[PDB]
Design a protein around this nucleic acid. Structure first.
Ligand SMILES: [Mg+2]
Ligand SMILES: [Mg+2]
Ligand SMILES: [Mg+2]
Ligand SMILES: [Mg+2]
Ligand SMILES: [Mg+2]
Ligand SMILES: [Mg+2]
Ligand SMILES: [Mg+2]
Ligand SMILES: [Mg+2]
Ligand SMILES: [Mg+2]
Ligand SMILES: [Mg+2]
Ligand SMILES: [Mg+2]
Ligand SMILES: [Mg+2]
Ligand SMILES: [Mg+2]
Ligand SMILES: [Mg+2]
Ligand SMILES: [Mg+2]
Ligand SMILES: [Mg+2]
Ligand SMILES: [Mg+2]
Ligand SMILES: [Mg+2]
Ligand SMILES: [Mg+2]
Ligand SMILES: [Mg+2]
Ligand SMILES: [Mg+2]
Ligand SMILES: [Mg+2]
Ligand SMILES: [Mg+2]
Ligand SMILES: [Mg+2]
Ligand SMILES: [Mg+2]
Ligand SMILES: [Mg+2]
Ligand SMILES: [Mg+2]
Ligand SMILES: [Mg+2]
Ligand SMILES: [Mg+2]
Ligand SMILES: [Mg+2]
Ligand SMILES: [Mg+2]
Ligand SMILES: [Mg+2]
Ligand SMILES: [Mg+2]
Ligand SMILES: [Mg+2]
Ligand SMILES: [Mg+2]
Ligand SMILES: [Mg+2]
Ligand SMILES: [Mg+2]
Ligand SMILES: [Zn+2]
Lengths: 116, 66, 76, 177, 136, 52
RNA sequence: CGCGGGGUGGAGCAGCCUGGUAGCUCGUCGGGCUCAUAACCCGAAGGUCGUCGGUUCAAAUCCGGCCCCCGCAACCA
RNA sequence: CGCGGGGUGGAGCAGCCUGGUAGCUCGUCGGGCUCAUAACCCGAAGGUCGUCGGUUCAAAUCCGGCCCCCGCAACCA
RNA sequence: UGCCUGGCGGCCGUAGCGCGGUGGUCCCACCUGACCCCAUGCCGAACUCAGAAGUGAAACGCCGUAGCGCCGAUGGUAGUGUGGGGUCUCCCCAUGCGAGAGUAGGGAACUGCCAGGCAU
RNA sequence: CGUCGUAGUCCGGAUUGGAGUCUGCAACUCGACUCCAUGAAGUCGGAAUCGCUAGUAAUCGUGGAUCAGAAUGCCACGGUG
RNA sequence: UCCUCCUAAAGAGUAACGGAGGAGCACGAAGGUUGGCUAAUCCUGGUCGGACAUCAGGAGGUUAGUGCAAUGGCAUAAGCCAGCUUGACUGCGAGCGUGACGGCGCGAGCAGGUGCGAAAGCAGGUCAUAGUGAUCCGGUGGUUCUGAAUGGAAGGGCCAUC
RNA sequence: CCGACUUACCAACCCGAUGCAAACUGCGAAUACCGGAGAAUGUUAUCACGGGAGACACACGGCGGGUGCUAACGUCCGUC
């Protein structure tokens, strides 16, 4: 029920950023894992896919789905975003509230290259 | 948890008629004195005698005989 | 015979259609209903009115999980 | 939480032996406790409302929430949005310990006890039975209460059927019959 | 006296009933009446034809009716102009549907059916025809 | 006509005042807010003034 | 829009007259008494003294903010 | 033919003032007293607000159809 | 290069409801503590954070079923002028124009990117 | 002498249910007494009003006759005042 | 005068006397930027509580709700709670239908901002649409415009208001 | 007091069926309204401005509303 409730909770924000057409930094946390991307303004193509399911990220972090791993993923994804040349995004908390793993990962992205 | 609005909540020591001391939490704190619990309750042996309906033929015969 | 009223009709309904140019600032539709919405490159006002931010030959389509009629924009 | 310990240690094994569910957690689970009191006199005196709320807060480990009038009713003479009902909802360790308190204190203390109905399951296993007084409870003092209230414990289960709810409660030694 | 318990509104437009109709086929009963033309069936007329069919069948069988005087027409009480707003509610009818079965009969022979439907023609000003339920 | 009209004058000394109403029968407390004045082009606190 | 009169238990009437003070006819009940509705008296209940604030030992009094009725010359775009 | 009012214990009126408060009297039931009755005084009971529907949480109370009466208007050649 | 699993575009009920079965390598959530960051107009119930003892009960995913809603047949169809008429409260002649109604007939999807387990 | 303190109280035993004795052949229409319990209203009483001056109103008791037994009753005697 | 629907020919609008229901606003919180939730209805059980107050499962999803009369809108929901607020600020700007005009029903954007959020995003009062009425002048307060000889000040003049 | 049984009665509600519209459109329209890419045509029949007008009292043949009586050399009507 959590997934459907969260998707309905996030429909307004996700459609808002899709229609605004500013490329949005997307998150979706789970208790055990998490996947972090950078998605196109309309949503038809991603830019960088970095997650705690990757080999190096998984083996360099003691626990996959925890806030410390979320912060490490934020650092890594924003630095790879700088490497590819990503500068401007408009945040999308994806229906959650801006606190916890999402807040720490977002602060990591701010430090490591994304302006928000 | 709200530590302010709710009353005090801690372990107590409570005793019953059958002497069983329950290491359970209560809202009062001080020791509690009860009367009957579910162990000494007459739910398994007293309920059938609670019917006490008796028999009219039995009472007639016992009171007197022809 | 006491009930013969009607509105001072407000002249609602689609005014500037798909296939008509949008001058800088122009609306597409005036309506009291969101029967035709703000899809791609379009916006809304205060009193159920929607004025498009983007010019050119307008695009009519139907979208939404609710089978809704929108107003989108082409490349003119 | 001796009831929690019993549930996690011996009750789970007993119900495994009973039901033979190939899934370990397929057994229905009790997941909350609800204690209700209905006061019509809220409109007459919000002050007695507050007194009853304080009594409920004393008897339960948590202060009750005051609900409002969902929809206005003419025959009951209460206005919509005016608070008319009170409730408490508990979980987990609170559930286990307060349930032990119930079974080992209130049940004998119920005046004229004759056993509780076995068909009190709300049709799907939700045990629902009422007691008329507040003095049958060990924290609500007899000598300090001026007006006696009532309450009905109603406990929602995840049982697919009233049969499995009754199996759970009888295995847990619930006082039905 | 067939007449609604309540109507949507007290009056309604005079209305239109042109073209082809939809009550072409028979639905409930064995024997029916067709009206190819166009007109109106008053509530008094519908009740009268029902009573007359009861008379003829001697309470053998059942009667069925499809159209209803759900439309309270406003005619104008005599000697009042076109003006002064719309007229006043006066009575109830249903109009004539080309192909419609109006009254239905069963349990009695075809001869008695055509007799009673000619008597419907003699208690109504409407053009008639004798119909029965269709095979599929 | 029960909601009396009130002119809202600034406390910054400038006499550009707005105007709304208030219902003294139901809400009698003074209408206290922060409000803008255009002459100083900055934000200050308004206090209600009688229409006079 | 301003002045003035005022809001007195249940009502109306005494005290705002430059702080130190709940009275009058009836309204209710109880008491004596006449057959007594009636009368006279005794007593009891009934008053943020329109509302809040400011000086203060001292308020209803002095003034300010708000509400209610009326008397007012005036104009009612 | 249209504009208003009214229909509330066994009877006559309020409450219709913009909705939650079943009020007054006569009358009937149980009394005391009376030579008996009346009067008198003391204890009780009695209602789906003409009706059928609608708004309203809820109506007598705001609105439409139905019944009757009280009134007025129901016109000019 | 293929199944399962997740993050997002193409269709927005031929997708959608239902019933018969399958998944814990990777994997979702259930789940251990919730003293913590953080929440309750009562409860870590909800969210959440430090963890992986177990988990597939509800859920998610996949196949089968045309039992429902839907798609649309082809004949057939009223009506719109247009010129002609009558049996003129409404019907017909030459065409362009043409709805619905349903039906014999289909569809549970289909499609794409990136990656994790799994093996060339 | 011990206990109670203005309340529905150990006031008040009322309404009632679980069981005996007698009398009466035969206790139910249509007997009381009794063991237990249920534990009411009633807080001096309304209008209007009766009998009592001295052993007097009252109040605590006894007896009788009625009668197999079934009264507070009606009638005689006493305690107190 | 001003409001909700069909009418009036599937843009538009279209009649009085072509059927039904109304207003002369109110909310400084019923608000907004930003944090949340999603109805109505019926069966089952329970001391109160009865069909319905309240609590506990289940069936449907906008048939609930709109601040009004109501239509059309609305799930992302303007429908149902609330931290900061008073965008219920102000000086300007390219632009549609009714349009005699008046303009009203319609504004990308300049700026000081405030208010808000980490930020996207905004706030351009409230679901829009009933709550409204001309000039002139005068009561009005913030504004040196003329300045009846020169230096000043007055009447009639712009913001907001009856 | 819970009650035992049945009874040419009414129908909630779902299925096998009947429905319906000025104030409903899970259907869909036509000529076309709005338009945007072409053959020819049309003495420029379109737009701006300046001088002056009438009428604000159009009827009958081919359509849908109230009407009205599904009447009329009928009407407010929208119309060739
Ligand atoms: Mg027809
Ligand atoms: Mg009343
Ligand atoms: Mg009153
Ligand atoms: Mg008596
Ligand atoms: Mg008498
Ligand atoms: Mg399966
Ligand atoms: Mg969880
Ligand atoms: Mg499962
Ligand atoms: Mg067809
Ligand atoms: Mg079709
Ligand atoms: Mg399918
Ligand atoms: Mg399926
Ligand atoms: Mg007493
Ligand atoms: Mg008493
Ligand atoms: Mg006693
Ligand atoms: Mg006893
Ligand atoms: Mg004797
Ligand atoms: Mg139209
Ligand atoms: Mg048209
Ligand atoms: Mg929000
Ligand atoms: Mg119920
Ligand atoms: Mg509203
Ligand atoms: Mg809103
Ligand atoms: Mg609003
Ligand atoms: Mg000067
Ligand atoms: Mg000078
Ligand atoms: Mg001069
Ligand atoms: Mg139709
Ligand atoms: Mg329709
Ligand atoms: Mg002409
Ligand atoms: Mg004309
Ligand atoms: Mg015609
Ligand atoms: Mg039509
Ligand atoms: Mg016509
Ligand atoms: Mg004519
Ligand atoms: Mg004609
Ligand atoms: Mg014509
Ligand atoms: Zn014990």
């Amino acid at each position: 029920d959590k997934k459907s409730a969260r998707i309905r909770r996030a429909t307004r924000a996700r459609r808002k950023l899709q229609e605004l057409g500013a490329t949005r930094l997307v998150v979706h946390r789970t208790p055990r894992h998490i996947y972090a991307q950078v998605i196109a303004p309309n949503g038809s193509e991603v830019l960088v896919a970095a997650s705690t399911v990757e080999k190096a990220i998984a083996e360099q972090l003691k626990y996959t789905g925890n806030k410390d791993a979320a912060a490490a993923v934020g650092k890594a994804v924003a630095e790879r975003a700088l490497e590819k040349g990503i500068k401007d995004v408009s945040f999308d908390r994806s229906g959650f509230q801006y606190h916890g793993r999402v807040q720490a990962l977002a602060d990591a992205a701010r430090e490591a290259g994304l302006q928000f | 948890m709200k530590k302010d609005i709710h009353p005090k909540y801690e372990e107590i020591t409570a005793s019953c008629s059958c002497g069983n001391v329950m290491k359970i939490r209560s809202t009062v704190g001080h020791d509690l004195n009860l009367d009957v619990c579910s162990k000494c309750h007459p739910f398994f042996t007293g309920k059938q005698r609670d019917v006490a309906t008796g028999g009219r033929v039995d009472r007639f015969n016992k009171r007197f005989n022809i | 015979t006491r009930n013969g009223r009607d509105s001072e009709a407000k002249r609602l309904g689609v005014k500037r259609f798909g296939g008509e140019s949008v001058l800088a600032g122009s609306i597409i539709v005036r309506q009291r209903g969101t029967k035709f919405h703000a899809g791609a490159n379009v916006g809304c006002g205060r009193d159920h009115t929607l004025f498009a931010k983007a010019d050119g030959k307008v695009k009519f389509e139907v979208k939404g999980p609710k089978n809704r009629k929108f107003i989108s924009i082409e490349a003119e | 939480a001796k009831l929690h310990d019993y549930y996690k240690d011996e009750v789970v094994k007993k119900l495994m032996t009973e039901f033979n569910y190939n899934s370990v957690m397929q057994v229905p689970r009790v997941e909350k406790i609800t204690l209700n009191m209905g006061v019509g006199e809220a409109i007459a005196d919000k002050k007695l409302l507050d007194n009853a709320a304080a009594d409920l807060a004393a008897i339960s480990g948590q202060k009750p929430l005051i609900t409002k009038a969902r929809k206005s009713v003419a025959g009951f003479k209460i206005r919509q949005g005016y608070p008319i009902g009170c409730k408490v909802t508990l979980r987990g360790e609170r559930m286990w310990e307060f349930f032990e308190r119930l079974i080992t204190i209130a049940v004998p203390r119920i005046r004229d006890f004759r056993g509780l109905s076995a068909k009190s399951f709300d049709g799907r296993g939700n045990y629902s039975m009422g007691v008329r007084e507040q003095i049958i409870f060990p924290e609500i003092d007899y000598d300090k209460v001026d007006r006696v209230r009532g309450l009905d414990i109603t406990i929602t289960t995840t049982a697919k059927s009233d049969e499995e709810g009754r199996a759970l409660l009888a295995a847990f030694d619930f006082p039905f019959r | 006296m067939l007449q609604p318990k309540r109507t949507k509104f007290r009056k309604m437009h005079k209305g239109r009933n042109r073209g082809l109709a939809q009550g072409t086929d028979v639905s409930f009963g064995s024997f029916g009446l067709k009206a190819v033309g166009r007109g109106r069936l008053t509530a008094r007329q519908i009740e009268a034809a029902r009573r007359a069919m009861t008379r003829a069948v001697k309470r053998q069988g059942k009667i069925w009716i499809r159209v209803f005087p759900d439309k309270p027409i406003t005619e104008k009480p005599l000697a009042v102009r076109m003006g002064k707003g719309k007229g006043n509610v006066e009575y109830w009818v249903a109009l004539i549907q080309p192909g419609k079965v109006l009254y239905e009969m069963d349990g009695v022979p075809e001869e008695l059916a055509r007799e009673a439907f000619k008597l419907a023609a003699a208690k109504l000003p409407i053009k008639t025809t004798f119909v029965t339920k269709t095979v599929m | 006509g029960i909601r009396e009209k009130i002119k809202l004058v600034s406390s910054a000394g400038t006499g550009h005042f707005y105007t709304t109403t208030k219902n003294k029968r139901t809400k009698p407390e003074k209408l206290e807010l922060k409000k803008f004045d255009p002459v100083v082009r900055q934000h200050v606190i308004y206090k209600e003034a009688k229409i006079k």
